[PDB]
Amino acid sequence: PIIAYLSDIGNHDEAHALGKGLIKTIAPGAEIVDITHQVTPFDVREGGLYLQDVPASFPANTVIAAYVYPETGTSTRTVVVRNEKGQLLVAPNNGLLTWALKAVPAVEAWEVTSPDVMNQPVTPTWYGKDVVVACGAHLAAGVAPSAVGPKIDVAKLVTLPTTPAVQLGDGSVRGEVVRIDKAFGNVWTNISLDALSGKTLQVTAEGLSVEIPYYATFGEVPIGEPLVYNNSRGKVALGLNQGSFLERYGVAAGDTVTIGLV
Amino acid sequence: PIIAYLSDIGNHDEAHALGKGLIKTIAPGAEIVDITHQVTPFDVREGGLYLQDVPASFPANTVIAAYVYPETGTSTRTVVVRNEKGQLLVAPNNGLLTWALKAVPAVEAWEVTSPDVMNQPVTPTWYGKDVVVACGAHLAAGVAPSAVGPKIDVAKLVTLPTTPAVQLGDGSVRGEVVRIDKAFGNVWTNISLDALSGKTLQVTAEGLSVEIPYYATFGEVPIGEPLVYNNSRGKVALGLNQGSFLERYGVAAGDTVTIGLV
Amino acid sequence: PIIAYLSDIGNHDEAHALGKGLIKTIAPGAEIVDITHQVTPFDVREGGLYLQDVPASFPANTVIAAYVYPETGTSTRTVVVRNEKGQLLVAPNNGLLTWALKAVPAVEAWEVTSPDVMNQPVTPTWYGKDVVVACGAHLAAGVAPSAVGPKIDVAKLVTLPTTPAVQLGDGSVRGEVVRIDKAFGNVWTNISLDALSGKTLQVTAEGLSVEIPYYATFGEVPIGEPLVYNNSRGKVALGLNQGSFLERYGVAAGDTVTIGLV
Ligand SMILES: Nc1ncnc2c1ncn2[C@@H]1O[C@H](CCl)[C@@H](O)[C@H]1O
Ligand SMILES: Nc1ncnc2c1ncn2[C@@H]1O[C@H](CCl)[C@@H](O)[C@H]1O
């Protein structure tokens, strides 16, 4: 069994590793694979976006244990979700799993109430470790999901709002910068390729209007010059060959962007 | 067997991983779990604080291999310590293990002198890899601790000084900021809750004097507002709900802080 | 089997971990050991330098899967190399493996052409995951190297240029700062000790000329003062005891440096 592990606690001190110690105590045979622990502090949306493509990439016998949990020690509970692939996801019921479940939908869910899957005495400021990680490790060790607490309708899993890309009427699409690919400065939108229907495109945002060609990969434009492309996760992206589209055009996550032909 | 691994060498290049290569060469069956490699360069105190809670969180069959070793290649030796839980700790004898052993005390110790647990030819500027990690991997592979070198009285393990919290006489406690919880800006003191005996508290430091209520977790105060709480490791902490108490009040590690009722 | 994994994609989000998911899907029994994912974006030279000492440190049954692949989705292919130790290396054929193969030379090589070792449909902007990592995992799972595609003469592996240290005639050596040891600010040159033949040395670069003694380790000079030493990888290095030689003298990677006796 594999536990895929994400938090916003950072990798710069022992905290994230104390969770790993707990995993090994409960499930010594579980293989721990970090997703990241560098989610922006308290940023449930950034964390959930990071989780979107994890289900498709990991084996079906994976437990995804993930928390960005500024609600720790409150009425906000942790949930377990079995998705269509056979994976189990454990997380605060705060919208963290919105995109992972869009990608690979939930078939059953449960609320985590049983102390026998918790690390007691649970500390109020770290439910991330003592409820989420603890329960993920019990699932990895073979505890049945239904033994964590009551079933709950898939419909009661909290979701955060997602802005659809909208076709405007002439052929251009008004959408949104979903995230920055921060290592490189590439800009990832929510605009699907099949929504625009070796052509060129007009791209519009508050800062500017530029004409940019479409290519399959960075190297099909000269160093420093821009391209629109289809990114690894199926959506329209903006970049510069071996440069930072973020720094040059100052785009930001959440900025409305409008894209259309010629 | 689990090797829990900490250094100040960073995770930004291959150096920390070359230790992992050495572990796998000596003990292919050992599971490597990083603690962190981002300890501040040369900061034995920060490293040792990071190690304090590792013994309680990890299984008893764990070897804690840890170095912040600006004394590498000198007369400062490496030691092996068996603690009350059955874990083995390997580290420079430079105070790095002060807090881990406060938390879970040493029952026996040894000086590392036998070359058969060293990666020879030992390089003078990296005893961290060639003595500490190498010996940790031999311990993980089954080498007996007594085979590393001479026994030494627990009393000769080097410790760094620790400032006790002092009750002043009226009911307030003069203490010290032990560390900053850097991902979030929470401030961790050495003041125990049972030392202050839903109340409010006066907190005093050089920068300021403010009145702050006590709660069990961040979410019991509105976003942006301060709380005193009991942190996950048993000590009094200062934070802001989804904010940085460090940045707002400018507190620092090592600052004397005084806290008392109403 | 061990997969040693390097990229320039960063560890701050899920991308590097999606490769790990793919590894576990193809080779669940493979142990994944990160080298680093913090190579500077697009910096093939920095990545290859990081890989130089990996072959010697890792077991012979290691697959080194490494990519800094700004050529992804282009005619630049991925290669498999068996080196003298029995390890397999998988990487873009773009010079990334120059130094790893200097250190432990290639005995056979192959071009990766067979789709049966690729993660199809390969995405054009991430050959790093879908060709390099995918093929590394198949090798770890037992696929034979010759089954990846056509053999190629070791001579056709792309290399990047390396500047030799040159003895100038009087006894001083003109060389080059190969890399900065970034955690600490130590300066690593390409000058061999046996090329200079408890003495003192004159060190010359554009910024300055200073006299610096030679010692085996940092602690043999007082805190804050400079030393020339032999670093862990066999070359002449410049540092300050518990300080940053980079910040004090402003040296940089690629700066010509000249060193000689008295
Ligand atoms: N000052 C603070 N205010 C609100 N939430 C905080 C916090 N410090 C840590 N957490 C939150 O504690 C969780 C562990 Cl359960 C992390 O996920 C973090 O999001
Ligand atoms: N310029 C320098 N001065 C003093 N100590 C140094 C150093 N560079 C690395 N180390 C020290 O070398 C150790 C590996 Cl044995 C690290 O733990 C580091 O603390």
Ligand SMILES: Nc1ncnc2c1ncn2[C@@H]1O[C@H](CCl)[C@@H](O)[C@H]1O
């Ligand atoms: N805007 C960009 N321009 C050129 N190359 C880029 C890029 N963004 C990512 N990569 C390159 O994509 C690889 C994955 Cl195959 C990484 O190794 C990276 O070097």
Ligand code: MET
């Ligand atoms: C930017 S890293 C290269 C691959 C990335 N997944 C993309 O499609 O933009």
Ligand code: MET
């Ligand atoms: C600040 S991260 C949340 C948990 C942490 N251990 C604390 O008690 O402050």
Ligand code: MET
């Ligand atoms: C600078 S980290 C200490 C060891 C390093 N490998 C060196 O020789 O400079």
